[PDB]
Amino acid sequence: VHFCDKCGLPIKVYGRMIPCKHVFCYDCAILHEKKGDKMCPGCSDPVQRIEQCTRGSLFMCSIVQGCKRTYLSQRDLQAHINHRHMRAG
Ligand SMILES: [Zn+2]
Ligand SMILES: [Zn+2]
Ligand SMILES: [Zn+2]
């Protein structure tokens, strides 16, 4: 994503979080890890490990609602559509 989901500021680096597979600002994403070490900035999920990536290394999904399940290969993001959207309905 561009604007951090927790800070809203323009993400300069893709702070990827696992196993959520969610992205944020690798800067505020690490401050959160140093804060709880296991809570996504917005999903508050067990942040296993945060990693930095380029704003072109993940694939954002845009089907309906706020589905921002990024991935590492269109095949996984495509697999996300048929796994949770299935043509929406
Ligand atoms: Zn931020
Ligand atoms: Zn998350
Ligand atoms: Zn989706």
Side-chain angles (χ1 to χ4, degrees):
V1 238
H2 324 259
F3 325 105
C4 319
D5 342 321
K6 167 262 154 60
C7 1
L9 260 59
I11 297 164
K12 178 146 59 265
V13 209
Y14 273 32
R16 170 142 176 272
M17 328 187 79
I18 24 174
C20 204
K21 231 181 214 68
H22 284 186
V23 223
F24 298 87
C25 18
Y26 189 62
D27 200 278
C28 324
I30 63 166
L31 285 154
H32 262 265
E33 121 178 70
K34 278 152 165 52
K35 203 87 208 85
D37 217 58
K38 46 138 183 221
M39 71 205 282
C40 213
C43 338
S44 182
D45 251 39
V47 180
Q48 167 145 266
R49 126 178 274 202
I50 319 190
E51 304 186 277
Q52 82 201 100
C53 253
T54 9
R55 51 136 45 71
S57 330
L58 315 184
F59 302 73
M60 302 226 80
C61 151
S62 176
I63 294 272
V64 60
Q65 216 195 100
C67 203
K68 302 245 177 177
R69 289 270 158 80
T70 15
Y71 288 95
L72 347 180
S73 276
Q74 208 82 99
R75 176 254 301 285
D76 271 280
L77 170 136
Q78 195 298 289
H80 157 78
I81 321 292
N82 40 64
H83 286 187
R84 329 285 155 166
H85 309 241
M86 210 204 152
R87 237 67 116 64

